[PDB]
Subunit: 435 residues, 2 copies
């Protein structure tokens, strides 16, 4: 049949240039590959092209030397339309459940293939969207199975760039939906950015943000450097796994995972990424270890790079320093509050172990996903908006749900923990609830 | 020549029952070995024996079953007198530097042996006192040097129970002062309390606190249950190591260490701990659940919370627990942020928290450490005994040639606006 594709950047701000770069680069591969713009629905906040801090206005890149990937990207769903509702609508094929954006869904037929590339971000069982709410794993998987029952695709491939991305699929993703998934990381470790200001694969001087992500950059460079009619899904995965682990040193890399129907791994790659005619006569099938940045560190390293640039504007400089100390104060409040809530619910001898214990690979994060969202609303109402950072704390919330704590107990613990602290503008009654 | 001793508990409150009990116990032993009351100086706040929460008023135990250790322990230095300046005066034998207390000191002679035991907690290069200021490794070592320059003894043994007690001697203890030292832990791990409410060798059901400390209770139990006229210093060390290590020494026990002149190891323990004459028909040879010292005070506050399941006072326990944690997060939080304003988010952590290799001093400039602690406390609040854990952070800020000026700038932005209530050095006194 025909190839459709969803591309999603779950991020915002020039700090997260790489996620919007990633989905922009992705669009171009599928264009060069004979996937038609008709059938590509690009989500992206779209605040990078004309960011005051973009030294090339109108131009996004995804390689230190790479060309523009912006020129041609449809503004399908930008700004506050980058929502889990619109994603689930766009995926299913239902324009009568989309709010805003350019009406484009995946109205696909049983003989078609869909490719999904996510990039930003993530925590345990949660994926970033620029604005609350976030994506929760069971919600995502539930859409996928709903789509299978509609007989809306033949086979699907999903690539998730995000921190602890494994946690979206482990113990909840069936292998009978004709869907195959790869994730930048397992369900308990950081993903990374490359092409970062002062790093071994160096970007241009003018660039103070990471241009791409180790995982994302790894598969897109792979697909554009090979005959996709010749190479298999499986060959790609095993090339992306090596590059993303930096030769199995996991201090500076992550474990690229496989989930769903592993039969899809025998298929030629062009069924999903199309065929670039230029790629005929390319090597069918050993690279230097790329210097990287912890995705959770990046957005703070960026604020610091500006602080050191902005020396000779003590007016503007001290606005950065203010923004930094505000961010870290909220980072520290959130971390500290979770900890105390643990102490109040389980006592201070066993609270850490209960909050931060990771289940065995293949068991799901939570057992009741309704409770997870419930606990998260309670937390935010009393303690403040998680922000994207607070996604790290989902295991905590999930592990509360797993310990069978009553909503009331979680209410008092939060009320006790936070009732006395002033979050400022960062409250769910301004920024909306994460769940 | 006569034997002398100095026993110091560095902590306060019913929560730290272990430490005043460790030293009381120690005194009773030393007396039992014929060391006189007039030769032993005792530092204890003295807030345990007649404490509301004591199920046995006027009594103190350092064992689930074992007897009163409080009976007749001298009240040489108690309350606000348990000060670094009194500790140094006493050890030096200097009556003119002593403020308050009995005015008992160690005026030992060139042929006299001395035993120093301390219990509470600590952090990198700092030992606790019930009130600020605390004890800094260099000032302690300095005093030990000075005492030896005046030949106020033949040989000296020093036992130190405290978190990261290795940091007090590593890099700054000479081996040529005729002083042997064991610590309860290396320079970067935690020491433990034992005989605790829930734990495996249980205390009396009546007690809501730990009764002793593993290393303290190990050496003292070893000494009172062995003919010390046969047992070596070295032999006790090994016995205390193996038990203090417990099952796992990295995280469940700790690494009992040795510093200074290791010839004292050869000698018979009776030279320092005396000879218990009811241990002649006593042989020369011979796992238990424990609480990390840093967390004992919350296990105590909780164990109290679960003994009110009795309202009105129950809510006041949770009022304290949260106020305690709230401030413990402020400090942890403040330290991180100061490191991000000095070094940026890339370095900050690696710089603050990096542990030098053994036999290296914690800090090169101690007067700098002292200053940075004061800058912090002025802007951010009293470290309290908890905040001693941040001493390597401050040590690491000094070691990176940072200015008082920039440290003052970082703290001001870090803590500007934060309301520590009455936990400011203007109320509590500066920790240094």
């Amino acid at each position: 049949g025909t190839r459709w594709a969803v591309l999603v950047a779950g991020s915002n701000g020039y700090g997260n240039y790489r996620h919007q770069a990633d989905v922009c680069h992705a669009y171009q591969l599928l264009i060069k590959g004979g996937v038609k713009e008709e059938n590509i629905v690009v989500f992206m906040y779209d605040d990078i092209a004309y960011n005051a801090m973009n030294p090339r206005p109108g131009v996004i890149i995804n390689h230190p030397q790479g060309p523009d990937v912006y020129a041609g990207v449809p503004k399908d769903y930008t700004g506050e339309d980058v929502t889990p509702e619109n994603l689930y609508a766009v995926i299913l094929g239902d324009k009568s459940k989309v709010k805003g954006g350019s009406g484009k869904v995946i109205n696909s037929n049983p003989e078609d293939r869909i490719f999904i590339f996510y990039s930003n971000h993530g925590g345990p069982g949660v994926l970033g969207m620029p604005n609350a709410p976030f994506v929760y794993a069971m919600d995502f998987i539930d859409v996928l199975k709903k789509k299978h029952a509609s007989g809306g695709y033949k086979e699907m491939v999903i690539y998730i760039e995000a921190c602890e991305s494994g946690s979206i699929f482990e113990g909840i993703m069936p292998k009978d939906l004709n869907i195959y998934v790869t994730t930048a990381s397992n369900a308990q470790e950081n993903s990374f950015g490359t092409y970062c200001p002062g790093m071994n694969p160096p970007p241009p001087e003018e660039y103070v943000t990471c241009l791409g992500d180790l995982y994302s950059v790894s598969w897109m460079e792979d697909s554009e450097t090979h005959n996709l009619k010749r190479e298999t899904v499986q060959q790609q995965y095993q090339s992306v796994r090596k590059r993303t682990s930096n030769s199995n040193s996991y201090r500076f890399g992550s474990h690229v995972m496989q989930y769903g129907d592993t039969n899809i791994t025998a298929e030629k790659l062009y069924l999903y990424h199309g065929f670039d005619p230029a790629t005929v006569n390319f090597p069918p099938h050993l690279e230097a270890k790329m210097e990287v940045v912890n995705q959770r560190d990046a957005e703070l390293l960026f604020m610091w790079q500006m602080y050191q640039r902005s020396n000779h504007q003590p007016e503007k400089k001290t606005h950065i320093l203010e923004q930094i100390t505000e961010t870290v104060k909220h980072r520290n409040h959130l971390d500290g509050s979770v900890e105390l809530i643990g102490v109040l619910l389980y006592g201070p001898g066993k609270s850490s172990s209960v909050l931060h214990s990771v289940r065995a690979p293949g068991l799901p994060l939570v057992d009741d996903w309704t409770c997870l969202k419930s606990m998260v609303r309670v937390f935010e109402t009393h303690c403040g908006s998680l922000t994207q950072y607070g996604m790290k704390h989902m295991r905590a919330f999930g592990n509360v749900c797993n310990s069978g704590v009553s909503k009331a107990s979680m209410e008092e613990a939060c009320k006790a923990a936070c009732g006395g602290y002033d979050a400022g503008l960062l409250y769910p009654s301004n920024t909306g609830y994460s769940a």
